[PDB]
Design an enzyme around this catalytic site. Structure first.
Site, short mmCIF file in Angstrom:
data_model
loop_
_atom_site.label_atom_id
_atom_site.label_comp_id
_atom_site.label_asym_id
_atom_site.label_seq_id
_atom_site.Cartn_x
_atom_site.Cartn_y
_atom_site.Cartn_z
CG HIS A 60 42.80 43.96 31.17
ND1 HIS A 60 44.32 44.40 30.79
CD2 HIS A 60 42.27 44.97 30.97
CE1 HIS A 60 44.15 45.40 30.81
NE2 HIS A 60 42.99 46.18 30.50
CG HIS A 90 37.42 39.00 37.02
ND1 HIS A 90 36.59 39.88 37.83
CD2 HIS A 90 38.72 38.97 37.72
CE1 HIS A 90 37.45 40.34 38.74
NE2 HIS A 90 38.48 39.73 38.76
CG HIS A 92 43.01 37.43 38.36
ND1 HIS A 92 43.29 38.41 37.79
CD2 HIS A 92 42.02 37.50 39.17
CE1 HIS A 92 42.43 39.29 38.29
NE2 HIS A 92 41.72 38.70 39.16
CD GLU A 102 44.67 38.95 41.04
OE1 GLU A 102 43.77 39.37 41.34
OE2 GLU A 102 45.53 39.35 40.07
CG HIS A 115 38.67 37.69 42.03
ND1 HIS A 115 39.86 38.26 41.70
CD2 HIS A 115 39.13 36.98 43.01
CE1 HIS A 115 40.91 38.02 42.21
NE2 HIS A 115 40.49 37.09 43.26
CB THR A 194 44.03 42.39 42.28
OG1 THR A 194 43.22 41.74 41.21
CG2 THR A 194 43.39 41.94 43.47
CB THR A 195 42.92 45.14 37.71
OG1 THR A 195 41.45 45.38 38.09
CG2 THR A 195 43.12 43.71 37.35
#
Ligand SMILES: NS(=O)(=O)/N=C(\Oc1ccccc1)N1CCOCC1
Ligand SMILES: [Zn+2]
EC number: 4.2.1.1
Length: 255
Positions: A60, A90, A92, A102, A115, A194-195
């Site tokens: 992911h 991590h 995105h 995000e 994040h 958000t996952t």
């Protein structure tokens, strides 16, 4: 779950109905509706004794994991009561520089978003914290493309070794302080992961100032794979959830 047409954000609600909940993340930050809150206390980012352990491609994103057995790297202050321990960070990011974040700011999408995930030590362990409405604090930092971020380069340098889902590498002695912008000016609001499982446990602290990263650094993110070794290549890009309904929430500015 994933980020494709058949398993992406539009599908998550079927296994995780909280996806359509009252305090989902991310959100658009409308700067003309956010209000300065003079009751916010100063943010305290205390990462001097951070103990990074390993970097993992989980299919992911890639995750840099820390030792959270003790108060070694913590977030305090701001909107927070108590002490929150850093467990991992991590990112995105997008396929192109005009998307990837995000959260958005007045509908603007940044190239990527960092994040830093922390859990509230009053609950003893992460698993217990994510059963609480104040269990987590996530520090969110936008990335734009410009000059290289020297503090990010050791991350970029190891990505070759964790190309596919399930691969990990030693990543000790990494200092996350090198990922921060100059200013700690932020917006804050109550939200979620958000996952999947999209748990509504997070106090979001989103920094106003983006960091700059180079085109070469972000291009190395985009060479990672969602797939496992020997499987057909699916580039790890556009691993972001779009903005969710704000509902009855208030976004507060520290500045
Ligand atoms: N934005 S986020 O919800 O924090 N993303 C994640 O959620 C968590 C969940 C638990 C601990 C740290 C992060 N990640 C990154 C992607 O892979 C799934 C895990
Ligand atoms: Zn995230």
């Amino acid at each position: 779950w994933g980020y494709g047409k058949h398993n992406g954000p539009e599908h998550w609600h079927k296994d995780f109905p909280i996806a359509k909940g009252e305090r989902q993340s991310p959100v658009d930050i409308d700067t003309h509706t956010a209000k300065y809150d003079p009751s916010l206390k100063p943010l305290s980012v205390s990462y001097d004794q951070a103990t990074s352990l390993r970097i993992l491609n989980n299919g992911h994103a890639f995750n840099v994991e820390f030792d959270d057995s003790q108060d070694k790297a913590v977030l305090k202050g701001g909107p927070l009561d108590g002490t929150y321990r850093l467990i991992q960070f991590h990112f995105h990011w997008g396929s192109l520089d005009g998307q990837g974040s995000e959260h958005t700011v007045d509908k603007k999408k940044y190239a990527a978003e960092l994040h830093l995930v922390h859990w509230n030590t009053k609950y003893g362990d992460f698993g217990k914290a994510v059963q609480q409405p104040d269990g987590l604090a996530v520090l969110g930092i936008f990335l734009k493309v410009g000059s290289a971020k020297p503090g990010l380069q050791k991350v970029v340098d190891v990505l070759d070794s964790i190309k596919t889902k399930g691969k990990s590498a030693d990543f000790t002695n990494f200092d996350p302080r090198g990922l921060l912008p100059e200013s700690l000016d932020y917006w804050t609001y109550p939200g979620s992961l958000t996952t999947p499982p999209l748990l509504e446990c997070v106090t979001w602290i989103v920094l106003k100032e983006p960091i700059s990263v180079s085109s070469e650094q972000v291009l190395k993110f985009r060479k990672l794979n969602f797939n496992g070794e020997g499987e057909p290549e699916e580039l790890m890009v556009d691993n972001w959830r779009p903005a969710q309904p704000l509902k009855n929430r208030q976004i507060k500015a520290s500045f």
